[PDB]
Design a protein around this ligand. Sequence first.
Ligand SMILES: Nc1ncnc2c1c(Cc1cccc3ccccc13)nn2CC1CCNCC1
Ligand SMILES: [Ca+2]
Ligand SMILES: [Ca+2]
Ligand SMILES: [Ca+2]
Ligand SMILES: [Ca+2]
Length: 447
Amino acid sequence: LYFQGTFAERYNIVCMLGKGSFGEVLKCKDRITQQEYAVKVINKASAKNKDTSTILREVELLKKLDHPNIMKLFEILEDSSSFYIVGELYTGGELFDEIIKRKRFSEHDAARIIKQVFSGITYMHKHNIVHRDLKPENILLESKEKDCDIKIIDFGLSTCFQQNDRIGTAYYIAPEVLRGTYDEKCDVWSAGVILYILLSGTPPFYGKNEYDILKRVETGKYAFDLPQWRTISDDAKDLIRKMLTFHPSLRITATQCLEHPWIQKYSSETPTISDLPSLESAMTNIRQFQAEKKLAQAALLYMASKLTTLDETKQLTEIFRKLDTNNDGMLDRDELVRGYHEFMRLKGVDSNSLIQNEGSTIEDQIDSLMPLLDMDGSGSIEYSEFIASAIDRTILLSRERMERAFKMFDKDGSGKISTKELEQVDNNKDGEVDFNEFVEMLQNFVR
Ligand SMILES: Nc1ncnc2c1c(Cc1cccc3ccccc13)nn2CC1CCNCC1
Ligand SMILES: [Ca+2]
Ligand SMILES: [Ca+2]
Ligand SMILES: [Ca+2]
Ligand SMILES: [Ca+2]
């Protein structure tokens, strides 16, 4: 293991993507799977503001964030000079450029975008994370596909690392930030500035230079005076007023943003007849997952949450969204119950008849499933738990994906897994699992 580095053994660097946020962002490629990722490279000696143990602890919390509108981080690796934070690669660019292209958005299109921002920030705040610098430049489009998910990026590292003059940041900061305070309410203000911009195409606190912009922000004074505001609904203006309330104690919370009537009016996404092949696929797979042993169940969640790409989960992602009726990015018990009933209704099948055919009602079925699906016991089914349980068990098992999952466990690199490193089947009887027996082990879970 002497001539093998953690990052360098696993990943090849392809090209530079960006510079600035504590370090450079590169595209990299997994040498086994050929899957592409973004990696942020942070210099240890220049940038560290805390011991490595603190940094690894806080980055681990960031890795556990599991929400469809928050940057997915897979790992943090290190060599003698750097930290390498490896994450999902998004290819649709900054929301900022979508503002430039479109100039401004209909209420419908604005609601769909800002709803995702609200859902993401809500989840962040529930996990005691404040963004601090929320703006369209730190929100990325997942891909170039129409109405793809947005992804909040570039937060969470500010206590750990020290940074090295970017245009337009002044537009988004809450007045209390000028007094040296960043709290959860400052994220709500920034989001409201974004929404003001989506609907009108112009910042609420505007000027030709940073001096004049900050003067207006300080007063908290804005108006809906521009001509374009006369054809925007009172409901949208009500939300904005609630978000750009001067005193943070009177300003609404992110959850209140997410729950606002104007948001709910433009989030009617729900299972239709076209979704039935997709729902039936998901239900078959989740039922199999329920029947599988917890060792199988745990091992599949690891594989799905780390080694799958966007194209593969895009289908399950749309279903997830249609089941997520409160738009918070996770599925609760009642959402799964309502989703099952709706699946039956759309299919032409009476749910009262499940008590004789299968032996129990939809509610009893979901209630028995929850403890098996909610593996971290969070009270909800987050995205990766859903994907783990609903994806085709076969697609998860390309040889390349099993190889990588094997290398993650074989921590001493001897060619064979043992105990602690993660029951064993063992055909040759050495008390260890080489790769070929691992491949059977995982292909026995699938059975
Ligand atoms: N995910 C991404 N995908 C593509 N390009 C990205 C990123 C990321 C974010 C990112 C990548 C990898 C690890 C991370 C760890 C902590 C926080 C953020 C991370 N930056 N950039 C480059 C572009 C340049 C143009 N301005 C917008 C960003
Ligand atoms: Ca939900
Ligand atoms: Ca959970
Ligand atoms: Ca080994
Ligand atoms: Ca063996």
